[PDB]
Design a protein around this ligand. Sequence first.
Ligand SMILES: Nc1ncnc2c1ncn2[C@@H]1O[C@H](COP(=O)(O)OP(=O)(O)O)[C@@H](O)[C@H]1O
Length: 233
Amino acid sequence: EFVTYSGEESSPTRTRILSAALSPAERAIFDVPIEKWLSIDRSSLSGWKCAVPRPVTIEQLRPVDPSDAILRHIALYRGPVTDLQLDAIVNAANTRCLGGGGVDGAIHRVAGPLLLRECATFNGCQTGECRLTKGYQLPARYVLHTVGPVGERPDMLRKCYRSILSLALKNGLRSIGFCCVSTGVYGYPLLPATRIALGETRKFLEEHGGALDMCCFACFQEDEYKTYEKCVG
Ligand SMILES: Nc1ncnc2c1ncn2[C@@H]1O[C@H](COP(=O)(O)OP(=O)(O)O)[C@@H](O)[C@H]1O
């Protein structure tokens, strides 16, 4: 059984979303127990498709240093997080966790409407916490929806990364595709955030050796790439 929230536990909107009719094929996908989604052959569901035409597999990722017993498990990817075929990818969401713009809107677009439907089953997400859902039409199996702080709040951003890494550990997920949380419209300075991102990930990797195969940092913008590229050296 999975741990699907990292914290401790509009309303008409969610009831509305949940009352919409589903096809039998859609209902079948949505009914798959969350713990079983990791290993299922998703093409046994007649209504499933991957909405990304050429996903990026873990064998196509470039470790920063295969020699290093830490950096062999970190990689940088240039492009959108939704491309990565990993156990989970990270969504930079908001309190309501009912979609929106930026990466959040992109992840809901690619995954399809069942993602929103799953998000409507629970009561949003607190800043610093993380919700686990299936990822439907994404090549990735799960989505880890975290809510980043608005503005530079280092303790909150650190919490986001620990919450993500925690649910990955508690549920036996071995790869994670990250996006650069809070550094878009939430206006968290990119360099301090990147240092926190890589910092927590390194710490975790040292404290839980062998727990993760790969932590991929997806850089949607060219500067995001270069920033991470040097912050890892
Ligand atoms: N359409 C998109 N596809 C993929 N990634 C995106 C898209 N839009 C924004 N991002 C990325 O998501 C990360 C967070 O940005 P944003 O979506 O504004 O979230 P936040 O509200 O936490 O800043 C950034 O790295 C940004 O480049």
